[model samples]
Target chain A: MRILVTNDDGIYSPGLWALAEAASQFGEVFVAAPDIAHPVRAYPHPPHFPAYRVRGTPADCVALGLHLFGPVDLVLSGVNLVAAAKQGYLFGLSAAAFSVPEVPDFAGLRPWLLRTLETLLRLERPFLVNVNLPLRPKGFLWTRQSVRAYEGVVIPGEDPMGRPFYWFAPRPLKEAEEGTDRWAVAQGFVSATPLRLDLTDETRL
Target chain B: MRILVTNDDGIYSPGLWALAEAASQFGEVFVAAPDHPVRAYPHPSPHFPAYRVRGTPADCVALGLHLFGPVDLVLSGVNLGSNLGHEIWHSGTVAAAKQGYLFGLSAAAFSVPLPDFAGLRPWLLRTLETLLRLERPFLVNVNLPLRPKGFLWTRQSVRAYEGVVIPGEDPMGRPFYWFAPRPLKEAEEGTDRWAVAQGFVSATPLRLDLTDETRLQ
Candidate 1:
């Protein structure tokens, strides 16, 4: 199996290395991740894995990895608290996004993620799963994406040079409902939300 | 009624004006769209009450309410291409509508294969007429063919992709990769892609909450 690992976080991020390392056990790992400086470059990371530094989004990284590496069986993205779940399936591969707390316990989360990956990979169809791991997880649960609302507040300001500017500040208007990804994580459970590419609202159709 | 009009193809785009004009028939229209390569401040256009936002398609929607006072509905695109299936996830045109939906309002994204503003105007007006009567907040993505055969409610088509990279070099000899991939599969029946392919205007209702309820079961 060939696994393509990517993230929106910079290439130098520890989370990227950790994801690449975890993915290494399952397949031949190819890391294509975004970076601040290098537009595109390649180097050996962790002294063995083939890593490509990309100056683009996580979606872009996945595309480049798939094209550059020939064929990839699975794509693993993020440890960025959250990431794109549906974006992976667009490329004809199953994928899992790992989201941890601001300060993660990789030691604790790694084991859970490995187990999650094993079970998910065993499934017949392609899946895009959003995995949100807490600091300490009591259990794992399948949840749905939360339909939370936020007020789009624009905070007007000026820079140090006294130039006019605007900053977007979103204020939450609702709390997480039960059986939602946010609710599961809030309740000390590892939340895995299956995502799909089709955004069509079936009820209206 | 106050309608906020926006698009991904930048503020100067004729589609933006076409959408804003069509929306004007249903309600008062306020244009908040991205500048060619732009920012978030407001500047009035000579033709309409508009803001040439120096930002993203999503940024325009976020700034809509605060800048325009209040917006009843958000309409995006008449985009350069169809935002079907997986494209909506990354489309700046759809992002504007999603932003409005996120803010608890009704929204819709419009797209066409080509820039046929004059040809598609009647269909655009009719789409607006049908959607504007709703008192409830909703999100819909509309796609028009150059020639119309009327509109149909449809689902988004799903397909896998084969990632295609076009590698090239710049004047300075620096290499770059363009990630332009095509679908590996074909459109399904009753899907937005199918409806448009059959020469019908496709209006697909979209949900902001991307939960796969079937998988949860």
Candidate 2:
């Protein structure tokens, strides 16, 4: 299988490299990713900056891999450096870090997964498995999204020019709800979430 | 009352201006919005390059109230269009109101119902006038039909679009993909879509907390 590895974290992120190295055992791997950090920029459009052969958003990486490169059999998003738990979702939103804000915490991953799944599904191919790894934990679990709470702040700092700049203060992770992605990661389990492209919540009337 | 106006539509949109004009009748209205159009962009990061002074709908409301100043009654949208059904979750307009709810502020999302090109301004103004009179900490979603005969308080329409995917080629000879926009399916009874289809303005109460703890029990 031809596997494609990408991440919201930029090209130099340790997680991206680690994911690339790990997935090499499975198939021929091609890595196309953003040159700079785009941690919370979810479903980004084409970058306004110059596009080198190698630089862009995670979505751009996927777009380029599927369109410019040869046909890909699988797309792997991250062995993310941070745990994408419920608090992470809020953190991501407050900081505008990686995914869409309207998406419930950990819910943004579904759309990205769906974007890929729909592509593969249209080709009548097998579903692509997206494995999101929490930082530090070596264990993993089959889990669903969970909600947690935390406090965050925007710190004021000065740029090199002495102009005011805002720094996002990282908050500690609160206790996780049972059976959540955060709780599983805290217990050292990898999160193997099955994602679908359809966003329809059919059960709600 | 200090009212903050914003939408998923960017800061410069005519819709935001229209909303500002209408809201000005009630109280002080300030507009902080995404610098660019975030149509269907939903809730996005405030940290990336894309995350700017004006960011996602959520960011616009959050920063407006907290970082800018204290605000009363966060009004999101008077959106160029409506956000109905399950699409609410993916709507920047709705997300803005949800952010206000998170901040312990009263919030509401308003939209002009689909297809009706005329009679939007007057209908929207009347709806806003009515909303200004309500007393309580409330979260409501108002959808103005394309042409409404009257108004109805209704529940969200739960439906799905039959989706289609299209593959094409870019000028560079690379394959590109585009999914066709899904049209609203036939409206079912007792739904927001059904009411709007019948030309009635629909107002649904939206709750911020999405805890379905009963399921866990």
Candidate 3:
């Protein structure tokens, strides 16, 4: 199986390479990713792996990678320090996104993630799953995305030059309910959440 | 009721004016919008007050609500393009409404594929009349075809697109990837896409939560 590895945290990020290294165990791994959001430039493929440094969004990398490198069997994104459901559905591939708390190195989670990747890659149907890994995971649980209210706070301040500026921050209004990704992670378990691209509220219909 | 109006297509868009005009019939309407995206600037309207915020549609909503004080309802778009199921992921039209919804206000995002502002006014009035009467605080995504038969409550269409990246060279001869993918299947029955395709106004209620409940079970 051919696997495509990418992330939002630019090409040189160790987190991107960590995912690439782990994915290499499962299939032919190629890294095509961002140097942050770009005007869609593809740099020369780098060494130690078949890597393409992309000057675009993570979604762009996935699309451009497939264009450059035929079809991929699976797409793996992140190992981000604080990803937290920020990833979007990328061109409808059977995909999985992994996020972990800030850690010194990915060595502790490597073996465990490889095992997790094995199962995710083997799934029969098309799916998009978000996996959040705790520092010391007790186990893995199939979880749901947490629903919570948020307060959008815009803090107005001045730059060093005394120019006024505004910064926006979203503060969650509630705690995670049980059986949610956040709750599971809080309990020291790996939370794998299957997400739907549809945002329709069917219950109200 | 104070209505906060915003859109992705900058402050001067006629569609924004169309919505604000329709909304004013119900209550006081204020617009905080981008003049080709923001650091906001206030514009003097001959009628109601409109501020051009140098920010995203979402930012306009945040600043609008803050400066305008309490807003009872929020409406975004009357967008030039359709924001169907898949498009909602990055729809600034939806994001504006979603931002208002996140702040616990009753919000709705309106989009139409057609450009005739005068032609869409009657239908916009009809849609707004129905939505404003509801007691419940709601978040809705609405899409209208060129000519509309009527309104239908719909669900988002969940379909995959055949991923395609067209390679092209810019004026500088730099290689670029244009990520343009097409849908793999036709729009399903009773979905937002199907409704709009059928020339009916597709009003799909939306929620902030994206949890795949069936997967959890």
Deviating ranges (above 4 Å) for candidate 2: A1-133, A136-152, A165-171, A174-205, B36-52, B113-122, B129-135, B166-178, B181-185, B209-215
Identify the runs in model 3 with alpha carbons over 4 angstroms from their true place. A36-44, A81-92, A100-104, A122-124, A134-141, A147-149, A155-167, A172-179, A183-190, B35-41, B165-179
Number of the candidate with higher TM-score, 2 or 3: 3
Per-model i-RMS: 6.3, 11.5, 5.7
How far off is residue A180 in model 2, in Å? 5.8
lDDT per residue (tens digit) for residues A36-128 in model 3: 223477886672778798877777777777777788767778876612122324355677887885453678778768878877876665778
Error of 3 at A18 (Å): 0.4
Instruction: State the fraction of real interface contacts model 2 keeps.
Output: 0.00
What TM-score quantifies how close candidate 1 is to the native fold?
Answer: 0.82
User: By lDDT, is 1 or 3 better?
Assistant: 3
- Residue pairs with colliding backbones in model 3 are B38-B54, B38-B55, B39-B54, B40-B53, B40-B54
Model 1 per-residue lDDT tens digits across residues A89-162: 77667888887755776777777777777777887668788887777888888888775533456788777887
Task: Write model 2 residue lDDT over B69-114, tens digit each, in one string.
Answer: 7778788777777777655655778777777766677778888754
Docking class of 2: incorrect
**TM-score versus the correct structure, for each prediction:** 0.82, 0.57, 0.84
Give the clashing pairs for model 1. B38-B54, B39-B54, B39-B55, B78-B110
